[PDB]
C-alpha cells in the first residue's frame, strides 16, 4: 500500500490524478520514474509519478 505524498494532477486520460491522503496499490516499480498503481475505490489503473507517492 503506498500513499500520495503530493496531489498528482495528471493531464492525459492515461494516468489517474490523485490528491494527498489518497492511497494507491503500486503495481510495477523498480526503476522507471513513473510507476503504475491501481485505485481501490472504483478499481481503475493509472501511471502514478514516483515522486508524488511513498511506501507507507
Amino acid at each position: 500500500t503506498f500513499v500520495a505524498l503530493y496531489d498528482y494532477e495528471s493531464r492525459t486520460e492515461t494516468d489517474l490524478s490523485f490528491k494527498k491522503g489518497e492511497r494507491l496499490q503500486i503495481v510495477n516499480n523498480t526503476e522507471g520514474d513513473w510507476w503504475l498503481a491501481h485505485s481501490l475505490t472504483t478499481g481503475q489503473t493509472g501511471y502514478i509519478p514516483s515522486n508524488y507517492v511513498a511506501p507507507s
Binding site: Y6, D7, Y8, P49, S50, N51, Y52
Partner: peptide, 9 residues
C-alpha cells in the same frame, strides 16, 4: 506548496 516538477517520461 508546489510539488516537484514531474520528471520526463
Amino acid at each position: 506548496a508546489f510539488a516537484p516538477p514531474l520528471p520526463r517520461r
